[PDB]
């Protein structure tokens, strides 16, 4: 988060924000529950009511992550349709305009397919989170039994300190305690391992997607440079278009670079 | 109290009062019962009517202390709101003015949170007072029984000095007396211990809060020094503001000093 | 604010918080509107509805500050009553206990009177804020007239560009603009001056109050040291109390130090 020490819900402008004023807030921000509907909210609340207490939060996280994946795939499909129909509109235009919008449509198609691949990786990470949820929520009943048996032992001791069940219940409490402390140890180990692996995978997918999208954007801007933005004076003829070969090579190079990209090929250097 | 030997309800001016004349009395001192309402007064009176006689005063003290804590938390919340909305007003002003009032709002926010922490400590001390009230008010019925039984013994002796109940009642009086004198001894011991511990805790919290507020005030005055109070002549332009970094470091240092403060780090030296 | 970069509504423990675990949250935090009543809320909302737009926020700040002052004076009076009745309870106790609680009552009385003095200073600062509110809210109608006249000029120009009123209205717009830009300049100057002076006064009062309360707390802890916390074994006699002279000199020294305190005598050194 970028907030400086102030009560303001506004952050100090960065270098990009200093370069130009930020655009006004989106006009599509309507008034609603802030999420669109209620069925997924009911699912989330059910995850927050019925599940075991100590696993309830992680089950809710898994459900919300599934919602995020659903929304991401839906918006990727919608972006694909938008690119297709944008190029459809650009078909009946100037030949230069038609070619430029067609190539932009292909680039957005690549962006959509890369989004789909990142979505598959994101679902793999979500499955890992589901696995850690499962193991930890199945290790919870050990401590549940420990708490129940210690409460029963306290109640029996208060009611009848000389009851014969005291010794056997004490052995059982010891046994659940040996079952439980070291189970906590194993749970911590597996939680650390699974969390580290899943988040490393997720961040590798994130950086790969970001770098591929950045390369696509750079190639698209270089190809936009090809577009002739010089206006033609009223009443004049249309100059001939000869950018088929240049955009031809540009899209060829974009595909070649996308094939060539590797995890080590990432040029992002954190400091 | 600062009153010198005079009938005056006025005290000799101190060095601070000698430096400048004291401000006139507050204009918000309206006419009322002096406390605002009646429900808490009814609660206090009920504490002063229904409880056991010797514990009634301490129960009243606990109730009044709860009232004080309620008022303190309410005024802390109101001060927080005042700081927020003051900085809100200062948003639409000069950039230097906006920054200075924003940082002042953060400082008052820190003052409010420190007040909340002191309030938690004060409630812990109030709980200790409640504990001493409970033990002492539960030890009162021992002396109540002693007084009742000695009155009964005197009445029986006057009515019938040869009654057979005289001997058994005398044994019971002895027994309550052995129950009561040493109970007074234990009550004195526990009262001393609890009072000393609770008041030491309260005074430690008080000095910690005072020192933190003093550091906040000093940093705030040093930051007010950053404000450009030089007036600009009519019709002239606004000089550029460059105090972001200086206040940046000032608030950083204030937070660092607040973290660094310890009980031994207090620089107040009573003589 | 002490929050580190995390979504947690919890701050990293400081040195004092590292020394001992923080006390649990206060048990007096009931369920209500969070402020106690509704009449002051109605007053605040009226300040936020009826006043001029650009002065509405500052008028609300003044009203909320008046509420804060009212609450502070009420809680100071309640603390005074609490100290008095605490010493009242301590009257019927051990002679050492009676003396120690009486002196503690005097110390809390001093704290209350210092709170009253700080309240007077705080009301002076609030009056300064009221003054800046008044001048700025009275300079707002100049820009109000400027906006009204420019809207009227635009409407007249659209309706009839050749209307004779165009020239006179244009002169009037120029005149309000000469009235308004330099009025903005003067408003910025007076706002800077008043804000700096008022906040310097407020912070001086704050640091003075904090230092006096810290000295009171230190003297009170040194006097608590005088209390004999050694328990007496059951069945034994009460050792004689001889702490009249020591507490005598301690309270004398506390009064002398309170008289001796000056603004320059403050030992708080911000870094």
From Swiss-Prot, chains A, B, C:
Superkingdom classification of source: Eukaryota
Modified residues (Phosphothreonine): 14, 233
Residues with Phosphoserine modification: 16, 45, 98, 163, 230
GO aspect biological process, one term: eisosome assembly
GO molecular function, a single term: lipid binding
Ranges for region Disordered: 1-31
Glycyl lysine isopeptide (Lys-Gly) (interchain with G-Cter in ubiquitin) cross-link site: 29
Biased composition (Polar residues): 1-19
Main location group: other
Changes after translation: Phosphorylated by PKH1 and PKH2. Phosphorylation is inhibited by sphingolipid long chain bases (LCBs).
Entry GO CC: cell periphery; cytoplasm; eisosome; eisosome filament; lipid droplet; mitochondrial outer membrane; mitochondrion; plasma membrane
Subcellular location: Lipid droplet
UniProtKB keywords: Isopeptide bond, Lipid droplet, Phosphoprotein, Ubl conjugation
Note: Present with 2157 molecules/cell in log phase SD medium.
Functional note: Negative regulator of cell wall integrity (CWI) in unstressed cells, probably by inhibiting protein kinase PKH1/PHK2 activity and regulating their downstream CWI pathways PKC1-MAP kinase pathway and protein kinase YPK1 pathway. Activity may be regulated by the transient increase of sphingolipid long chain bases (LCBs) during heat stress.
Name of the protein described by the UniProt record: Sphingolipid long chain base-responsive protein PIL1
Organism: Saccharomyces cerevisiae (strain ATCC 204508 / S288c) (Baker's yeast)
């Amino acid at each position: 988060m970028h907030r400086t020490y102030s009560l303001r819900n506004s952050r100090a402008p960065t270098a990009s924000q200093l370069q130009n004023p930020p655009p006004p807030p989106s006009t599509t921000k309507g008034r609603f529950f802030g999420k669109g509907g209620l069925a997924y909210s009911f699912r989330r609340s059910a995850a927050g009511a019925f599940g075991p207490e100590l696993s309830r939060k992680l089950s809710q996280l898994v459900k919300i992550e599934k919602n995020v994946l659903r929304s991401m795939e839906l918006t990727a499909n919608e972006r694909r349709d938008a690119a297709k129909q944008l190029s459809i509109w650009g078909l009946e235009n100037d030949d230069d305009v038609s070619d430029i919008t067609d190539k932009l449509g292909v680039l957005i198609y690549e962006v959509s397919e890369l989004d789909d691949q990142f979505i598959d990786r994101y679902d793999q990470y979500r499955l890992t989170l589901k696995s850690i949820r499962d193991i930890e929520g199945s290790v919870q009943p050990s401590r549940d039994r420990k708490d129940k048996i210690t409460d029963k032992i306290a109640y029996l001791k208060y009611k009848d300190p000389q009851s014969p069940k005291i010794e056997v219940l004490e052995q059982e409490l010891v046994r659940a305690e040996a079952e439980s402390l070291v189970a906590e140890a194993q749970l911590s180990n597996i939680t650390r391992s699974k969390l580290r692996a899943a988040f490393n995978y997720q961040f590798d997918s994130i950086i790969e997607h970001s770098e591929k999208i950045a390369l696509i954007a750079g190639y698209g801007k270089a190809l936009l440079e090809l577009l002739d933005d010089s206006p033609v004076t009223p009443g004049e003829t249309r100059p001939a278009y000869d950018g088929y070969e240049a955009s031809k090579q540009i899209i060829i190079d974009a595909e070649s670079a996308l094939n060539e990209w590797t995890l080590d090929s990432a040029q992002v250097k954190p400091t």
